[PDB]
């Protein structure tokens, strides 16, 4: 039985009229046969009497007025649990990897309330990434959020691939990747890098691609969140990778402009900060489990001041700043050690040894940035003999916090290295204190632990 | 809990006290639902600002009384509402509970307790959208509020009934400075209120744990509208907090209120305004966004004894009431001249500007002298602090400009070499740890040490250890003087001599 | 929906009907036009961009049972403005206005079963005391009430249904 | 720790009380639906009018 | 404390199954003006657990 | 006898419906019983069919639809004359001090046309203020406008009090102080400082402060001006202080947005240069008396090109700048003689 | 759905007789007044740019000859 | 986006299934070079923002370089390709890294160029090397190089 | 049209248009009254089609040639205003005058860093 009839189609926006007794509530999923294909609609607004205003999830071509609309009395609801792991799904929880049906046991609706402040679990357990610079300069705890800010081409996506691999075959916990506004080339590269690196079996992939209607791109973050929340309920410490928040805000802007809402400060939607809060407030640790998260944030035209990066800053606990200058020098990952920060970087939670090592690295690099122009104008032979040592030690630090990734091998051929936090602190604390003043600078470039530095110098 | 008779007697009392008769009520139908706004048909006797009761024990606020429909904003989850549901008109313009009984409890914008600890015990209700005391009903601000921070209490004194804007870029210690002011209010007559607008729930959880840990919670009301709650709750929160504070103000007591991110209230009001098709203004914020912040902050006032005597119908005679507001504003890259910042700066009586490049350099709290002022000023300050602190602000500003010059001038005059040392020591002295509030006597004697040169040998380094050891020494021996200073705040040539004797004995006989 | 566009026309029609002592005829005339407005073929014609004048003539023709004052003027004025689809509401508004001037209220009562005609006459005289109008009760037999009655008098409602008491008790718990 | 255990005791007591409320009011609904007569319905209406 | 309150609730739930029989009749008799019909118990016990 | 019905309430905007023939005129004042308190509405537009759109001179909360509205046949009227000296009033001419009641003999409407061309004084004259810096570097034309640009702490209030004193003692005029859109704290302390200096007996105060609905902040300046005009008709020289005219402009912008008119050059109302000229044209010398005006001015973002400063400077005859540097030198009044200007 | 300056008693006049043009084309009635702009009903004889004479001794300039009303200043 | 996401490289199984045999082993490809015009070099516009967000890289052509004579006026370092060496012959991939580092050093040391003979010879050798690379990239139209 | 007639006779013709910008401006003045939603800076939605429908038919053909010089006013000296920006694509030689050079008194005030030719 179907009871609605289509009364308008304007682009991706469809209006459906129902009998006055049966009007679908907001966010209900309607269903219609777009020819032989099956199209679902999400109810955005109940406007006027018996009419309903909706966004088409599939493409709107081929719809005609008077088609019958069946209302599924549930929101869009998706399969969850172990069954998802190593599949690719779209926003509707339909497979796109052609490996047949998902074989589900349970379905959850994608819209749900966030935890209350009483259910939260105060925690300070630091994660141990395989990356020297991130472990040292920007530590973050379970349930925290990390933002990889930077321009285009700086390495956000490959940094997230490295994190997925390191937190999938060193610590064996599950992971979920929600590619909102994905590029199909990059999504296929991701699928093949994870299938080749044997980690595919511990990652659950959701893709909303760039060539899909706006609301289809918008909902995907909620689909990935809903899978991470199923895994959390089981007691796991899940990790959720959001491939770009900027494209989530752009999808929200597009959807809001289609519905004809009055636009805001920079043409963004009025609900910008409430959409960001409804997304980021569900990502929290709780007394039963936790969702940690890392989010790539593209900063358009290189300013942290426009509404999207400005509004996401309020939610992050750690911010990594990537720079194309450092990348063009040939140092990867291209993290700027001076501008990346964390709320958890204080002696009380990381210990005085880690805090002192980090502050000393930053001080050495700042002093080197000061000396650089005196070196340029006067020349190095004029510097004082303790400054001629700060220079060399800063230059070796600046080499040592580069690192070869397991996933960057296809770019460089060299094998990747995983570095424990203990080895990172030991290496930097040794370098700053002069234990390695006898090694060349290139002995530290693209090495793992300091043992590889001494062994490379011995080979060099 | 084995006594299931407790459950049966609870249910039996509920059944027994159930009132069987019914009464007339006025009813309308939901015609439209979208984005948090509903249109209601009917309710001929709805009045603007009324509370309309929806099915599910939640409310909407009638904002638009159009000729044939009522446009209301839902306070809570709207998405389960549908066309055809029926709503009832309460006879009430927007209320909130008030009184001592909710002092020390966590509640949301509607005064419902989100604390889990049961229901409130208020006395009566207060209208949320009230009107401030008139020109003749106020009094001059001339009593101190101590924030427990050496930098603020010396350079930027706050008075009871003042409005001081905590303004600065993201992540520069705004929330920390506000909650440390609240924690300092413990063991003063001042009752504290913290209104969190748009905050993530983990921040609120941490804030409440730190309030109870340091024992300040029994003094303070916490009003919560988290980042995920409907914009109507975020927009209308500070007015609920202001009413709960004004209850104490009107009874001749002192209150202090912190509005966390008024800039987020302005964003929530912009959203709720645009969703009602109201014309926009300079940055899409509605036209009356100034009259949003103004009519809130003007309620923070000190009221004279005749006003409180007439309001309380003669039950209190000598008291003067006050409410002190510390709104927080977040700037972007320090552009003070933005729209909402320069409005709130045109409303308040001062600003505590927090500078990000001082905060990253470890100068915490990162108050920026010069650009930060209190226009109430020394009238609020206690006499000993007014005497000791007179120079510190200008000395610091000129030290900062001189130390900016210094980088280009090595081998510089030995006269400025001393100003540029003494400024660098005073700037090193005024930072302090996260949750450590400091009493007026402790700050006073540390500032006396800094101003009367007792640093100049220890000017080397370890001035933090010197400061801690000095406090512990004075706390061991001369506590009767710390008592006199804390009780009177007075300053005399006799007290000057006593403080000389204290530092002379400390420098000669102790270590750091 | 077009309550707001129908208000002026209903007020004008009524305020004219009392200048010419024919409210009762105007009501049935508007009811006739409101029925012609609903036909499937006429509703296709009204959507069509004919010139207002010829569309009005194409509407006069299907209703000859109409005064010179009523059809040939009101329908033409509404056609010039393209308001003809508002007729079903111009009717209801008209009725309401009448009930206002005649000091009448169409109180509705709802019950699980028929009332004793002593209960119902008591209801009439009591509502006529609650209000200040001649009431005109009409009953409905709705089983979900199970016992008691709902009295709806416009936006005012008095609920004595056992289901209402049950669900209220459910929320006292 | 004891204050948190007290919060969990409150939660469990309220959950039990809610379940028994829901079951008892549905039971009262089916009792009243079966256990009715016109003399009681007239008496109810006569109290309303 | 978790194990203590769990067994305390498990013990309570059985007795509340007795109490709900009484409370459903209480909730019915409270809201109709002539009291509810005796020996209708078969439908209440069908609801009861 | 009330004759209108409230038909809409949207924020501070209220629509009321009258019989087709009894429609109020444009600036007439209506009133309503908002519970116990009476509320005054100032009409702004006449819409079709007897509907009239007005703005509330008070809190709009609590208004039902269908309330009875009474049509007063005249604009807002305020007391004038000697009776108002030393008092404090709001827009509606009601005492907001607590000294009781104003024994005025006469009431004037706040809206009227500026002096006619043949009525202006065919002469030009200076106003001896008695202050060396002002009299030398920036003389005052009798009937001119003067801008005050200083900040805070510079002694602005003492300058205003000295002017209020001198215009009364040495000359024989009075003064009106209209505080529009400014802090309540400053008006309270200003009242206390004027009564502690025996000048309160010579100045009449009107206040619409920041905590007031838009219409009050809009019309308070016209209330002050129409009292200054009643002093003028008596043959005196009057001083009118406007504590911030930029807030008069900004409240006109808010009311314009509420009425739904299209935004002008920088979002300001389309009627900006008219709303400004309608005020500033009544402050003129006449061949019966004169009103001189001292207006504190605020420049948004320190931009002398913004439409509000650009419109205000068209009217100012003189410009006095107050500087903190001159005050740090211990020189009072802290008038900067290099930037202070007069035409 | 919005009104277009057709109101109850003008509709009633059209109800009395549709061809109200049997009355003078020389005159009309003010229908609204807002910020110096005026809307007039009638004036079938009006031509754009014409001086329209108001009560008292005042003039308005006919800027718009719309379907049913004249807009003037 | 739904225009540009149609430019794709397609694996051999898609080609073999689409053509129903008759082609095997081969991969299909379509390469898209959209062109965008910016008003006074502002990238913050609407359509430039969308297309810069969609594509795999950008070639930024600047008028300040074109006027100086650097033609084609590609602005390196502000211009990105996210494909990198994977789309290069191994000889080009080998030789390009020193060009990238030489121009990155030149861009860092560019500021001092207005005061060249205040500088040290060590940095001077980098500054005048980066100028020679920039001069070497210049190339005449319609002369493709193998 | 007169230039096109002389072109079709096989002649070669000079066409001078003394301010083409006024054509688009008169279209902007009319555009709002025709009930068309305004565009980027006020201009009619059809600015580029209105301009191209005129500009594309002023061209040389195999039967005759039209050589043309157009003055193109740029409002408020803003070379990025939609009307100049959309005019630039049509021409073959663009000479850009600038007020700065004229203030020097250097007439002809051509900017040689902005003028170009095919
Ligand atoms: N005096 C201090 N000493 C040491 N650490 C501090 C001090 N003040 C603040 N911090 C730390 O700095 C961080 C930021 O503080 P806070 O949360 O108050 O900043 P904020 O400006 O309120 O943040 P946001 O603007 O993002 O809401 C916190 O991790 C806090 O612990
Ligand atoms: N660690 C690395 N090793 C080698 N190449 C890298 C590394 N990080 C980034 N790249 C290069 O950067 C290009 C794109 O990086 P990506 O992560 O897509 O940046 P974005 O953050 O813009 O998505 C890749 O093609 C790769 O060649
Ligand atoms: N003419 C004057 N003679 C002496 N002192 C003055 C004079 N004018 C101002 N001052 C000093 O300057 C101070 C400025 O304070 P105040 O007048 O309150 O500033 P503002 O009125 O701008 O807020 C006065 O309190 C007084 O100490
Ligand atoms: Mg990317
Ligand atoms: Mg904060």
mmCIF file of C-alpha atoms and ligand atoms in Angstrom, chain F residues 151-159 186 193 332-333, ligand 3:
data_model
loop_
_atom_site.group_PDB
_atom_site.id
_atom_site.type_symbol
_atom_site.label_atom_id
_atom_site.label_comp_id
_atom_site.label_asym_id
_atom_site.label_seq_id
_atom_site.Cartn_x
_atom_site.Cartn_y
_atom_site.Cartn_z
ATOM 1 C CA UNK F 151 36.402 59.101 24.859
ATOM 2 C CA UNK F 152 36.079 58.409 28.576
ATOM 3 C CA UNK F 153 37.924 59.739 31.602
ATOM 4 C CA UNK F 154 38.703 62.919 29.632
ATOM 5 C CA UNK F 155 36.230 64.923 31.723
ATOM 6 C CA UNK F 156 33.396 65.137 29.180
ATOM 7 C CA UNK F 157 30.814 65.213 31.970
ATOM 8 C CA UNK F 158 32.522 68.133 33.691
ATOM 9 C CA UNK F 159 32.540 70.000 30.377
ATOM 10 C CA UNK F 186 26.153 56.964 33.726
ATOM 11 C CA UNK F 193 26.973 64.769 40.198
ATOM 12 C CA UNK F 332 41.738 70.746 32.034
ATOM 13 C CA UNK F 333 39.610 71.019 30.003
HETATM 14 N N1 LIG J 3 38.022 71.213 34.885
HETATM 15 C C1 LIG J 3 38.605 70.245 35.628
HETATM 16 N N2 LIG J 3 39.364 70.555 36.703
HETATM 17 C C2 LIG J 3 39.949 69.599 37.447
HETATM 18 N N3 LIG J 3 39.843 68.282 37.207
HETATM 19 C C3 LIG J 3 39.110 67.840 36.159
HETATM 20 C C4 LIG J 3 38.441 68.814 35.296
HETATM 21 N N4 LIG J 3 37.794 68.115 34.345
HETATM 22 C C5 LIG J 3 38.034 66.802 34.583
HETATM 23 N N5 LIG J 3 38.818 66.637 35.664
HETATM 24 C C6 LIG J 3 39.275 65.337 36.207
HETATM 25 O O1 LIG J 3 39.070 64.308 35.238
HETATM 26 C C7 LIG J 3 38.242 63.281 35.793
HETATM 27 C C8 LIG J 3 37.458 62.612 34.671
HETATM 28 O O2 LIG J 3 36.398 61.821 35.202
HETATM 29 P P1 LIG J 3 34.941 61.864 34.517
HETATM 30 O O3 LIG J 3 34.503 63.302 34.392
HETATM 31 O O4 LIG J 3 34.056 60.875 35.235
HETATM 32 O O5 LIG J 3 35.205 61.297 33.033
HETATM 33 P P2 LIG J 3 33.954 61.018 32.061
HETATM 34 O O6 LIG J 3 32.948 62.057 32.480
HETATM 35 O O7 LIG J 3 34.496 61.196 30.662
HETATM 36 O O8 LIG J 3 33.545 59.609 32.407
HETATM 37 C C9 LIG J 3 37.412 64.011 36.825
HETATM 38 O O9 LIG J 3 36.930 63.102 37.816
HETATM 39 C C10 LIG J 3 38.450 64.936 37.416
HETATM 40 O O10 LIG J 3 39.265 64.236 38.356
#
